[PDB]
Design a protein around this nucleic acid. Structure first.
Lengths: 136, 213, 62, 191, 356, 75
RNA sequence: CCUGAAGCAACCCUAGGUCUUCCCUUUGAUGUGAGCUAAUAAGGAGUAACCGAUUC
């Protein structure tokens, strides 16, 4: 529980992987390596209803618990790696992306550098749903 | 009922002598409990650092991958692994009404390291051009791509890895290709999109500690 | 945060669901040049004063 | 008295509206200096004609409410006269100055409302106009004194004196400041 | 303001964003070491003066002493006794609300030993009052025009020096502190009192603080005069129109147009510890008549209320001041110059020979 | 819940409070005195009319709805 | 008609104590207890419950 960095100026950086699907949100802090995990609070751990796992609210709760949990270990600032589902599926991030990123900045952390890391394929395998799509 | 972060030593990370800001940050490890060792489990971690943070303050769109190939003592020693342009940059460059020319060469340094370099270049629209398009014919494209490969090979092949990174810290290769292809078709947004690492020589320490000052 | 005075310079358009908020261009009495857009309840006139609790946030123009 | 027009027996001059914002929509000084709260009106003729009604008359208008007391301005004028006597006793200030201070301290700065990206809905925070500030300031401390007096020995004149003293202070004891702070809190909670 | 010679060495540069971010808490109370001069009683009966019942603005011959830190005999005495930073209200008002600065201004720092004499250049345009500085467009007129920045500033300065004396019952027994005015019937109503500020980081500050007059109710007055010359072009609303429905609007509009002047005047009063700052609404006869003036109205504001109203931060004012006194109590002796970039928003600091 | 039982006539110690206290108050009204002594408005009025005719409190205004007195001046 | 009462730092006058402290007693402050009020505080929470697509 002791990052031996200087009390005055030294910022200890983590990196927060915000995987935001359209029916879940993840907020997951790691080393600059990306190997050693510190926190992972999902949208679904906080709220107990299936329809609001992908909420701005649930993502706001998740980022708040992550912010509080990582402040104790002594992670001061965070780099950001945002992503939607990707592959064959959507490449627009979920509605929890904005509220989560906002929430762990309202909660007194520092924001380093942000970038999209969605798995964008060269050209991909056949997408789920028939030739005639998802008819409803 | 075991606090899992009680047994965690923090380790300072060090970048090689080629960059201005030496230390990248800190790294977590588990205390040597049993047979598996802290330093051995810590050896071979890939750190993706933006060149803005790696230097003092510059371009933030070029990133360098660095491998902790050895640990001396409370200090991870990273070494040049690879390079990649950011998604935002690559997506911003690729726009409609022009020709995108892509090359890749599999070239080896004087020491063991064998890289794969990917070059990219987009056909520039002239200052008095009224034609919307500004496309390159197929033979003009592959004459450009042949010249891309010829420079990319020459620049790396003849000198060692310390000097090829010193060339990738600016974009001397991309500026050289861009000026070279002015006669065939004027390109503008020319970079070495990506550098990959395929083979390393069998690990040395004296060769690492020359790169670490 | 210190409470700051924004002065209405030109009333632009009416907004809200039931046409209830006047959206107005304000010119800051504090800084010489900074002019932002704010949604305002009640009746507002061209050339009077507002007391903003924050002098950074801005309302979405339509 | 061809020079000064003492409101019953209260001085016009030497009352200052400190706040620059509420200064135009508060009429107490130099031309709105009149002897009685009572007058003809014609302040509902055009849009911002209302701003020129002496604040004492605005208070006298707002006071007469809850059905059984619609259009008893003579009874309301005697309530305001008795309240100004009682304010002067307990405070020792100019009762017009205490009223002006209570108007400033009671008026909210921010309120919550329903806005757009029309499709669904959203309750965001917005500003209140300097007229809306003074309009709601008067209404709040009038209804505060009203509901306080209902089923009580403390007479309407005493309840008004209580509200205007405690609101001019900024107590959070007057219904005016209590409710102001509730609206500004909700306005913050969803901004 | 000044033509900068090739012998003048730039040492330090500070821009307005960096100066805006500064703060200092812990600034202690000002201690009246000396109170000098004699101040008249104010006629509260010039406030039965509105848009309908105005007054003639008359020329009053009373002698104003524009004596700087260099020529101050009490500061010259106090120099050796205690204090290492000596200033006037106009000078520190400039540095404090420097953030709003539009035009080129200058301050001569004179570090003789372990001292800062924040001095002003006599026979330079420092004691002019600027006009419509911070408008959408400042007056873009030529020196031969009557609506020029020079000619508007000239008459604005005159009417302020007129108004301060004219409103005053200036031949009824004066309030005397201890001494007569240290500069000399002929004189003008003004009182100079010196104050010590112990300033956290290890600086003692002795500034000369000026009250304009006394009013009863006793009470001390800082008094200034707001000018309205040709509103329709000037990029402001008319004063004579009604001013009574729109007083708050006529005020806030003339404030933005004179952002730095009203900021210097208000921090001037906060410095002196005046409990009330009054004003004087002066306009022309016809919109292009430089000679005539008529006093429309006056409004009174407690400077503490006014400064939080208009905009100021004591922490900013004292935070910028600690920075500049620290810079020039750090670097070497001789004559300096805090000059603001004529066209851009940044203050510069040159080191100069012993002459200019 | 709660109920109010005021006095129809003075207790000895309540009248001792009234004879000592109510000429110290800045505002003297039958409603104020009614709350401050646990006494019916009828008793309050009758007591304050004693206090006035006695010549101890300075009346400011009388009205069927509102009768206001104050403590008499000092010098 | 009588109610408190024993030493006053030291010299002269003066009144046989012509005298002002134990404390009776009232006004001004500070701290605790209790009431009304803060307040519907805030938080719990825009959570739980209930309703939502679909059939004309």
């Amino acid at each position: 529980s002791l990052g031996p960095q200087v009390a005055e100026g030294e910022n200890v950086f983590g990196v927060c992987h915000i995987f935001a699907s359209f029916n879940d949100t993840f907020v997951h802090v790691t080393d600059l390596s990306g190997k050693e995990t510190i926190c992972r609070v999902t949208g679904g751990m906080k709220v107990k209803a299936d329809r609001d796992e992908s909420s701005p609210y649930a993502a706001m709760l998740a980022a708040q618990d992550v912010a509080q949990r990582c402040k104790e270990l002594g992670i001061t600032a965070l780099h950001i790696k945002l992503r939607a589902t990707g592959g064959n599926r959507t490449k627009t991030p979920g509605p929890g992306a904005q509220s989560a990123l906002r929430a762990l900045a309202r909660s007194g952390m520092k924001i380093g550098r942000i970038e999209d890391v969605t798995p964008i394929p060269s050209d991909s395998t056949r997408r789920k749903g028939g030739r005639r799509g998802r008819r409803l | 009922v075991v606090d899992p972060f009680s047994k965690k030593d923090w380790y300072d990370v060090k970048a090689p002598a080629m960059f201005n800001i030496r230390n990248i940050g800190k790294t977590l490890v588990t205390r040597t409990q049993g047979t598996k060792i802290a330093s051995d489990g810590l050896k071979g971690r890939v750190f993706e650092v933006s060149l803005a943070d790696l230097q003092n303050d510059e371009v933030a769109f070029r990133k360098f991958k660095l491998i902790t190939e050895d640990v001396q003592g409370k200090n991870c020693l990273t070494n040049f692994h690879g390079m990649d342009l950011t998604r935002d940059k690559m997506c911003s460059m690729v726009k409609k009404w022009q020709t995108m020319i892509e090359a890749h060469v599999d070239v080896k340094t004087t020491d063991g390291y064998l890289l794969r370099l990917f070059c990219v270049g987009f056909t520039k629209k002239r200052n008095n051009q009224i034609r919307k398009t500004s496309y390159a014919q197929h033979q003009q494209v592959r004459q450009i791509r042949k010249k891309m490969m010829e420079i990319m090979t020459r620049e790396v092949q003849t000198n060692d890895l310390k000097e090829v990174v010193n060339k990738l810290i600016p974009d001397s290769i991309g500026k050289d290709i861009e000026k070279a292809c002015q006669s065939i078709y004027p390109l503008h947004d020319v970079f070495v999109r990506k550098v990959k690492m395929l083979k390393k020589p069998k690990f040395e320490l004296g060769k690492l500690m020359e790169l670490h000052g | 945060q210190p409470i700051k005075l924004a002065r209405v310079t030109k009333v632009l358009g009416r907004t809200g669901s039931q046409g209830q908020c006047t959206q107005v261009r304000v010119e800051f009495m504090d800084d010489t040049s900074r002019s932002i857009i704010r949604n305002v309840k009640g009746p507002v006139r061209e050339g009077d004063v507002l007391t903003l609790l924050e002098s950074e946030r801005e309302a979405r123009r339509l | 008295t061809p020079d000064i027009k003492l409101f019953g027996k209260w001085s016009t001059d030497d009352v200052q509206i400190n706040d620059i914002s509420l200064q135009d929509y508060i009429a107490v000084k130099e031309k709105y200096a009149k002897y009685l709260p009572h007058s003809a009106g014609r302040y509902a003729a055009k849009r911002f004609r209302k701003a020129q009604c002496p604040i004492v008359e605005r208070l006298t208008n707002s006071m007469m409410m809850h059905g059984r007391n619609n259009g008893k301005k003579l009874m309301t004028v005697r309530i305001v006269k008795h309240a100004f006597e009682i304010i002067h006793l307990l405070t020792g200030e100019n009762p017009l100055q205490v009223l002006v201070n209570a108007i400033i301290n009671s008026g909210p700065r921010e309120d919550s409302t329903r806005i757009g990206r029309a499709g669904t809905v959203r309750r965001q925070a917005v500003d209140v106009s300097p007229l809306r500030r003074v309009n709601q300031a008067i209404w709040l401390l009038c209804t505060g004194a009203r509901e306080a007096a209902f089923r009580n020995i403390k007479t309407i004149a005493e309840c008004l004196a209580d509200e205007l003293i405690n609101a001019a202070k900024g107590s959070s004891n007057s219904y005016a400041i209590k409710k102001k702070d509730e609206l500004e809190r909700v306005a913050k909670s969803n901004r | 303001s000044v033509t900068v010679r090739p012998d003048w060495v730039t040492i330090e540069e500070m821009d307005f964003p960096r100066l805006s971010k500064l703060t200092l808490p812990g600034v202690k109370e000002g201690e009246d070491v000396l109170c000098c001069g004699a101040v008249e009683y104010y006629d509260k009966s010039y406030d039965r003066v509105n848009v309908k019942n105005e007054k003639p603005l008359q020329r009053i011959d009373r002698i104003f002493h524009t004596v700087t830190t260099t020529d101050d005999p009490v500061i010259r005495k106090l120099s050796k006794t205690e204090g290492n930073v000596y200033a006037t209200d106009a000078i520190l008002a400039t540095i404090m609300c420097c953030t709003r600065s539009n035009y080129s201004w200058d301050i001569v720092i004179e570090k003789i030993g372990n001292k800062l004499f924040f001095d002003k250049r006599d026979n330079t345009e420092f004691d002019l009052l600027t006009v419509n500085e911070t408008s959408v467009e400042p007056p873009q007129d030529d020196g031969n025009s009557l609506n020029s920045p020079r000619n508007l500033a000239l008459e604005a300065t005159f009417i302020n020096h007129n108004f301060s004396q004219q409103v005053l019952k200036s031949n009824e027994p004066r309030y005397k502190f201890d001494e007569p005015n240290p500069f000399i019937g002929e004189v003008a109503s003004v009182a100079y009192r010196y104050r010590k500020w112990d300033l956290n980081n290890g600086i003692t500050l002795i500034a000369r603080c000026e009250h304009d007059a006394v009013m009863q109710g006793t009470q001390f007055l800082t008094i200034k005069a707001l000018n309205e010359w040709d509103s329709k072009l000037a990029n402001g609303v008319e004063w004579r129109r009604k001013l009574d429905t729109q007083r708050g609007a006529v005020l806030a509009n003339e404030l933005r147009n004179n952002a730095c002047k009203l900021a210097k005047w208000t921090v001037q009063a906060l410095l002196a510890g005046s409990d009330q700052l009054k004003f004087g609404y002066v306009s022309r006869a016809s919109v292009r008549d430089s000679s005539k003036h008529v006093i429309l109205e006056t409004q009174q504001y407690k400077p503490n209320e006014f400064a939080t109203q208009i905009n100021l931060n004591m922490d900013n004012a004292w935070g910028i001041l600690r920075c500049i006194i620290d810079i020039c109590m750090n670097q070497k002796d001789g004559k300096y110059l805090i000059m603001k970039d004529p066209n851009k928003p940044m203050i510069r600091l040159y080191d100069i020979p012993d002459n200019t | 819940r709660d109920k109010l039982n005021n006095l129809v006539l003075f207790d000895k110690a309540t009248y001792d409070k009234l004879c000592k206290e109510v000429p110290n108050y800045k505002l003297i009204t039958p409603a104020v005195v009614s709350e401050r002594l646990k006494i019916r408005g009828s008793l309050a009025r009758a007591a304050l009319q004693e206090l006035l005719s006695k010549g101890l409190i300075k009346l400011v205004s009388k009205h069927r709805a509102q009768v206001i007195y104050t403590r008499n001046t000092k010098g």
